[model samples]
Target: RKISDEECPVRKSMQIFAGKWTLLIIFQINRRIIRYGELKRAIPGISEKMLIDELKFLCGKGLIKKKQYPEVPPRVEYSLTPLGEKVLPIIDEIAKFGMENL
Candidate 1:
């Protein structure tokens, strides 16, 4: 059986990395816990709605952790979960490749 399709494990894993803004958002979150507003400012071009949507997707997938504080304006912080840390090396190598070429 030489066929490969959606059922492939690699395909399923890569699906987690899918989304136009997924990698960028993951890169920004990294190992540090960042506030919602800070992350929005860090990525210059992503719109508010897109960020929220991407965040919810990541959270639902159990990759990123969203901690909400009991406050008026809603203080929320985002960071990588253990699962996300496991995938960081892939992203790191991609960044390494870009840096080496640059």
Candidate 2:
């Protein structure tokens, strides 16, 4: 079936990331590869469930790269993919704009 813009998959994809914490999560990951706990602390007021959901959503979209190490404690980290890096410059611009304007 044909999907209109409002119901299109692209629109749905954007909607998934349109949440309050999603962009911040992406920004943090762009800064560096971080552990789950670190990511949780980086963004104040973000619940564990919300962080997990946003991380999974970004991973599913091929925007973030997840690395898991084989070890006793099971070290895991998240960083940006090539596509994810593409967003960083734009994010930087947004940050600069915010600092200048606000």
Candidate 3:
């Protein structure tokens, strides 16, 4: 396959997790499946729009799964996909590095 001038494998890996709320979204929802409201409260100061868009974007990237249950209003839960699960250690390392160094 031909590689595009602007593209690389590292770019692909980062594309899914890149952005302000992306990593936080992944970090907050770590292992347990959380409702939208639960996630909102878990992450402070992130706007409603950013969360929605990020959630959908992550879902589109196949890094997370959004489960919606039909109820009186609606019940939605977010969980990490297997690929997303793979990110935990990287996040842990980043956290460890930040804590020790910065």
Model 2 stretches astray by more than 4 angstroms = 1-13
Q: Clashing residue pairs in candidate 1, if any?
A: none
* Candidate 2 pairs with clashing backbones: none
Span of ten consecutive residues with least summed lDDT in model 1: 1-10
The CA root-mean-square deviation of candidate 3, after full C-alpha superposition on the true structure, stands at 3.1
Instruction: Report lDDT (Cα) of residue 68, candidate 3.
Output: 87
Off by over 4 Å in 3: 1-7
TM-score leader? 1
In what order do the candidates fall by TM-score, top score first? 1, 3, 2
lDDT (tens digit, per residue) of candidate 3 on 16-102: 767888888898999999999999999999999999999899999888999989988899999999999988987899889899999
Clashes of 2: 0
What's each prediction's TM-score?
A: 0.88, 0.78, 0.86
Model 2, TM vs. native: 0.78
* lDDT (C-alpha, whole model) for all candidates: 0.90, 0.82, 0.88
lDDT of 2 by residue, 1-102 (tens): 686588787676576557787778778988588998888898999887888888888899888988999999897799988988777776788799999999
Counted clashes in each candidate structure: 0, 0, 0
